[PDB]
Symmetry: C2
Subunit: 250 residues, 2 copies
């Protein structure tokens, strides 16, 4: 055993082995996790994508969204055959986040992935800091559970809706960079998704001339990128960002 | 607007997010295909359902021929070997014809440049770059001639200021292509690999000391990213880069 150690832990051609399957790397069978902002377009689509790929998922959003979370979770549980549950939490409330940690463990079993899907005078600077601490503490309990259960996982941070988004975006990105460096050894990856203009419904012509694809993204085009980053397909990807913006930045 | 941008595709029971990652019905090619990244990326695309041409130098014809068989057998798609010296525009012209003849069209390409006395270093780099640029070019010429979209993926890997110079040029090229070809339904992206193993135990932990994951990547860990960028899973992704480096850039 001198060279045949490097050959055991570093195959050059996994695809040669009949038991290797590239598509199974995008599967979430056996995996459990949660999605914040889950009553919204990005969150519930990401959650449905993970559930259809085989994960158990907790849908997390504000207590005021309970009935929507409960209906979405029943619908996904039925359509995809996994345990999708609803867990209300206002993550700016410390006690509720502590309770969420308990209920994730007690109702899911463990946490393998978290999609921390954050929503965006001197009032703005106060509310930016409040919502960032909410994001931070939610990611924190996610990786505490991972560590406490002795396994790895995947954290995915995003922010969606000018100075406020830019400052929030920069903060989250630096936050994910440090997590990626500090938790890599616990098997925990951290990445961000930076969405461009995504359709969300009425409640144009100018901003689409900016976008080289000349259209908006849909919620499912973010959801497929979340599945990549949450799945083993992205097992060597940490500390980075995926821009999903139709070319906006280019 | 109503019907153009659906909000919850998952509510259709004949929709699946996992079909986005399939390459069934797709055809394309991979350069540097005898090397680690290229053959692993070819095998990923073929396993996912694509017909694939393996392109590399004429000196690799036998390797490519065996690789094409290995993958045709394992995955049931048409995988072929096409040698080409891509610094020769005549050969690249013939490569374009052979691709259209033997595959039917090109939907994706993984342009996988290798790296690699002052005048000579700059000349070597620019010849290498230009080989990448023109194989990229025949790919989107074929897409546009045949009236459909596609996906281009560019990477440079070791085969350091020469590597850095090559990486910056390819990134600019892909940014330009992504802007220019979006109208034609053609995406272009890059992959930036970190330390990937392709064949001393303390010299091991030596360079891993600045990799947070404290291990080398493996060729399959780049292949799966190639598959993500080639498939409809990344349909709103263009003009950007995916770094696959085990945390190297955030140490
Ligand atoms: Cl959050």
């Amino acid at each position: 055993t001198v060279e045949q150690i490097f050959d055991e832990r570093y195959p050059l051609d996994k695809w040669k082995d009949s038991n290797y399957s590239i598509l199974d790397k995008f599967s979430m069978r056996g995996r459990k996790g949660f999605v914040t902002g889950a009553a919204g377009g990005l969150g519930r689509n990401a959650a449905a994508a993970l559930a259809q790929a085989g994960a158990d998922v907790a849908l997390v959003d504000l207590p005021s969204q309970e009935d929507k979370l409960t209906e979405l979770a029943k619908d996904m549980s039925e359509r995809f055959g996994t345990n999708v549950i609803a867990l209300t939490c206002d993550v700016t409330d410390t006690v509720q986040v502590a309770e969420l940690k308990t209920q994730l463990v007690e109702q899911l079993g463990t946490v393998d992935f978290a999609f921390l899907n954050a929503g965006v005078e001197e009032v703005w600077t106060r509310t930016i800091n409040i919502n960032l601490n909410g994001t931070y503490r939610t990611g924190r309990i996610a990786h505490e559970i991972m560590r406490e259960h002795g396994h790895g996982g995947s954290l995915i941070f995003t922010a969606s809706l000018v100075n406020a988004y830019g400052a929030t975006k920069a903060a989250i990105m630096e936050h994910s960079r440090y997590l990626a460096a500090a938790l890599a050894k616990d098997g925990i990856r951290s990445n961000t998704i930076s969405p461009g203009y995504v359709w969300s419904g009425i409640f144009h012509d100018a901003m689409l001339e900016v976008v080289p694809m000349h259209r908006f993204g849909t919620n499912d085009e973010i959801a497929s990128t979340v599945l990549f980053l949450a799945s083993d397909a992205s097992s060597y990807v940490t500390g980075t960002d995926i821009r999903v913006d139709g070319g906006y930045s280019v």
